[PDB]
């Protein structure tokens, strides 16, 4: 699972960060996306066709640079990506420019995850439930005999 | 039980901005071209006027 619980006031802080990161990113987007020097330097550079993007074993932003709709957190989902709604950017020409554009959009989609995950955060345990694969808390192992045994054995 | 953790608000946070905020700014391009031609033509007016004066001054000297 997770090492330990969040600190006391961080959920209120990632929100305050995200509210301004939304515009701090558009600002970086403006001097590159329609820069004609940045365009001319990467438009037909690094073109990979969709059929040999599979033969080379390429994935992520290089496979989705070439037009193929495949990413793991939608196709074979894990770790509460089912519960979080987002979309996926996929380029069309296999070049460095669409590999740039899909990153500039994955920024936006990650920010969408962050605000949906700050809104939908539940209570409960943060580690797995049993003390035979990760340690008891130090409140417990200093008074519980079973928990001291488990703490001593999970570390040796 | 759960006591003392970081939890979200009772109604949640209000939505942040994740769309592209790239509004098209500026005049139409033909406005900029018309202003460019107007500035350049007025400069040519003053420049060619000054050359003709300088020629008349040369006649005097």
């Amino acid at each position: 699972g997770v090492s330990q619980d969040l600190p006391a006031g961080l959920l209120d802080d990632i929100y305050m960060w995200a509210t301004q990161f939304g515009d701090r990113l558009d600002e970086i987007e403006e001097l590159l996306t329609d820069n004609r020097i940045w365009k001319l330097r990467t438009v037909n550079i690094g073109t990979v066709t969709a059929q040999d993007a599979l033969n080379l074993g390429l994935s992520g932003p290089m496979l989705r640079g070439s037009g193929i709709p495949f990413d793991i957190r939608k196709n074979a989902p894990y770790d509460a990506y089912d519960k979080v709604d987002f979309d996926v950017p996929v380029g069309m020409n296999g070049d460095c420019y669409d590999r740039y554009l899909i990153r500039m959009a994955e920024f936006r989609q990650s920010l969408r995850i962050i605000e949906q995950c700050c809104n939908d955060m539940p209570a409960g345990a943060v580690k797995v439930e049993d003390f035979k694969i990760n340690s008891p808390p130090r409140n417990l192992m200093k008074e519980d005999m079973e928990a001291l045994i488990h703490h001593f054995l999970l570390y040796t | 039980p759960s006591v003392g953790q970081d939890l979200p608000p009772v109604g949640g946070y209000e939505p942040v901005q994740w769309r592209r905020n790239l509004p098209a700014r500026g005049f139409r391009p033909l406005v900029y071209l018309a202003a460019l031609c107007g500035i350049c033509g007025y400069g040519f007016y003053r420049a060619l006027g000054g050359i003709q004066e300088r020629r008349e001054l040369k006649r005097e000297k």
Partner: peptide, 24 residues
């Protein structure tokens, strides 16, 4: 319409459960 008059979010009614229910 100001950054003086923006609300704080630390002063808020937060979520609170009596008890968590997770089925095994």
């Amino acid at each position: 319409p100001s950054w003086e008059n923006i609300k704080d979010i630390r002063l808020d009614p937060k979520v609170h459960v009596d008890e968590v229910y997770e089925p095994i």
